[PDB]
Each structure stands twice: as structure tokens, then as C-alpha cells.
Paper text:
HnRNP A1 has two RNA recognition motif (RRM) domains, each harboring conserved RNP-1 and RNP-2 submotifs, and a C-terminal flexible glycine-rich tail, which includes the M9 sequence responsible for nuclear import and export. The RNA-binding region of hnRNP A1, comprising the tandem RRM1-RRM2 domains, is referred to as UP1 (Unwinding Protein 1)17. We have previously shown that hnRNP A1 acts as an auxiliary factor that promotes miR-18a biogenesis; however, the underlying molecular mechanisms are unknown. We show that hnRNP A1 specifically binds to pri-mir-18a through interactions involving both RRM domains in UP1 and a region comprising two UAG RNA sequence motifs in the terminal loop of pri-mir-18a and a flanking stem region.
To gain insight into the molecular details of pri-mir-18a recognition by UP1, we determined the crystal structure of the UP1/12-mer RNA complex at 2.5 Å resolution. The crystal structure reveals that each RRM domain in UP1 specifically recognizes one UAG motif in the RNA. Overall, the mode of RNA recognition by RRM1 and RRM2 is very similar; in each domain an AG dinucleotide is sandwiched between the β-sheet surface and a C-terminal helix. In addition to the stacking interactions with RNP residues (vide infra), the adenosine is specifically recognized by hydrogen bonds of its exocyclic NH2 group with the main chain carbonyl oxygen of residues Arg88 and Lys179 in RRM1 and RRM2, respectively. A positively charged residue in each domain, Arg55 in RRM1 and Arg146 in RRM2, makes electrostatic interactions with the phosphate backbone of the AG dinucleotide. Two charged residues in each domain, Glu85 and Lys87 in RRM1 and Glu176 and Arg178 in RRM2, contact the uridines in the UAG motifs (U3 and U8), while another charged residue, Lys15 in RRM1 and Lys106 in RRM2, interacts with G5 and G10, respectively, thereby recognizing the U and G residues in the UAG motif. Similarly, in RRM2 Phe108 (RNP-2 motif residue located on β1) and Phe150 (RNP-1 motif residue located on β3) stack with the bases of A9 and G10, respectively. However, the two RRM domains interact with each other and this intramolecular domain interface is stabilized by two conserved salt bridges (Arg75–Asp155 and Arg88–Asp157) as well as a small cluster of hydrophobic residues in the interface. Importantly, the molecular weight obtained for the UP1/12-mer complex (26.9 kDa) indicates a 1:1 complex (theoretical molecular weight: 26.3 kDa) and demonstrates that the 2:2 stoichiometry observed in the crystal structure is an artifact induced by the crystal environment. Although the stoichiometry does not reflect the solution conformation, the RNA-binding interface is expected to be conserved.
Numbering used by the authors:
A (entry chain B): 8 to 139, 145 to 183
B (entry chain A): 7 to 188
Amino acid sequence: KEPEQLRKLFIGGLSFETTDESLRSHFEQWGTLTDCVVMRDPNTKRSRGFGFVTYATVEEVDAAMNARPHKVDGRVVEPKRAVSREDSQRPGAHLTVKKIFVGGIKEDTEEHHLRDYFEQYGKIEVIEIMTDKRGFAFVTFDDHDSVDKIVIQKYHTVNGHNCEVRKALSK
Amino acid sequence: PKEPEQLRKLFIGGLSFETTDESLRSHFEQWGTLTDCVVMRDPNTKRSRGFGFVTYATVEEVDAAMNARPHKVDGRVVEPKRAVSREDSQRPGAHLTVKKIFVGGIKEDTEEHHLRDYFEQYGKIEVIEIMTDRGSGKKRGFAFVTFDDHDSVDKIVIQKYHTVNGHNCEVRKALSKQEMAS
RNA sequence: AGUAGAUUAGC
RNA sequence: AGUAGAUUAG
């Protein structure tokens, strides 16, 4: 089957009223839910303002993301690809961005190589190979979910060779 | 439509210093087609650095090569391992040989057969141990699995996600009680 | 002494 | 409390 982590969305900005039951009845419009939970404060039992929805298939996850915007219990909420507990500890893991850093490209790698591999994740806006070639490049998408789909994957083969993918940064 | 290059690549450690790209190739193409084969050399001396990489066309061929250990290349037994990505190679101890993994993030209803059901596919299991807290009696949220061949572990840690009992869980090479307090 | 690729952070 | 799951080191 497909790994649980790839079938899970993080839902940001929940209302205090939002429950496992209310969250479920909304997001089950886009598929079957293997799990649906609001994270609550262990001591107060207040909602902590976010939850998780898990579909049976990644297709259903994709459908829910394609049906943005999402309003739950009177509140616009923010669904994003669920970053694993391990990757969540890395700085910038949770930023909403449209641009990725691509490092480890070989010297004969051209722009159409990068386009051929990254098209599958979403509409590409801009590709820029760094010149001085220094072995890295930048790709800009029009939808942050395109980036999120990319960084939850481990390997990326461009022109027959692995390369590392990171969210592009401000500093 | 291939399989990622990183999963098709083996690190070959301990090469004879006379081994070349071609001699390394003629040995390892006995187990399949090689999309690449290289001896790593020092940039200034051009001398061999004592290790290389071979990449097969399919991971199936990688498995065949690993199942044919030991491998003697140009008179010397070499040590082939799953090629750890440059990114993962930067963390301490990434290349140490272990048969035992730490498994963290298992739910309270996760049983011993759940762990065995998922990890069997990587190799013969020797020992599974779910950690229960003394003084409380219930599960602590992690476990340990011991395999019979380190390559089983190496095949596990080059994958990203591991769904045990319907939930993701993290896998790390196990360190000793001493090594951890440090 | 030894078996981890290093041209993987933009003007 | 209010947008990252600490029951993830024996």
C-alpha cells in the first residue's frame, strides 16, 4: 500500500470548537478516512489548534488538496502535507514556500533535465541553474503544495543522478 | 521509469589499490548490467582512494550482488554496502555496521507480530523486543529488532517511511546504553 | 595509518 | 491556549 505518512495531511488553524467528529464529516467528502484527530492539550483538554486527516490513498489526499480553499466550522483552515516527526525537527520544515534549492546536479545537466523530473509535481514557473556551473539550481512553482509533495520524497533522480532538495531560504 | 539512482548504487570499500574502473566493472557485471562503475581517486595524486561505486540497472541486480558476498576483486576481498546518500552520510556513525535497529513511534496496540510482519521483507530476523516500562507496565513507544545480516538494516535505513501497524515509525541504527549518554 | 562521492546556498 | 503528533534510547 502507500505509506501512512504520505496519506496524511496536517490541518492548521482549527477553531477551538472543532472536534475529531466535526473535522471528519468535512474531509470525508474527498475520500475514506483511516484516521482523523484533533490534538488536544494533555492538561486543559483545549484544542491545540491543529489536527490530522489520513485518507486510504494518496489520490484522495491529492483530491482534498485540489479542493482548496477549505472552511471548517466557520473557520478557514490550512491543510498541508504532513511532515514526519523526524523531518519536523529540521529548521524551516513547516514554511509555506514555492521555491526549492536543488543541489548535486552534474555539470552536463541542463534546464530541460530539471523540467522533465519536476513537472510531475506541479506547474513549474521558473528554473534557474546557478552559473558563477556551481552544481546547484533553483525551481519555482506556483503552488506551495508542489514543493511539499517534493520534499516528503527521499530521492530525486535528475539526468540519471540523485540530487538533494531543500526549501529555498531567506537569509 | 527506473528506480532512483541512489537505490541502484553500492559503495565498494577496501579496493585493491591497483583496481581500475574496468577491472571493477568486469568483476561486478557478473551480477547484472552496470549503468556506472568508478574507482574514486585523489584529485592531486590521481591515486586510488581505496573505494568505489557500482550502479546497476535494477535494484534486483543490486540484491543479487549483495547475495553473492564475499567478493574478491583483483586478489582482494572487498566490502560492498548500500550507498548512503551524501546527505545522510554527514550524520555521525552513518557508516557503522550494525544488525540491530531502534524503532521509535509505535502505538500502544502494536504487538510483536506487527513488527515482524513488516520487517521480514528485509532479511532474516533474529530478535524482536518491545520495550515496556518498569514501574508502570505499559508500552514506552519504541522497540528493538535484531537481524542476522547488517545488509538487512542497511536496506531499511535507505528507505524513508516505515508503516508498522498502520502508522509511520522512525528507524535508527541502535547505539549502546553507554553511547547514548554522550 | 585505515573503506563515504564534496562544485549541494542565488547579486 | 491559540498552525507540527514528544509513549522516539534498552
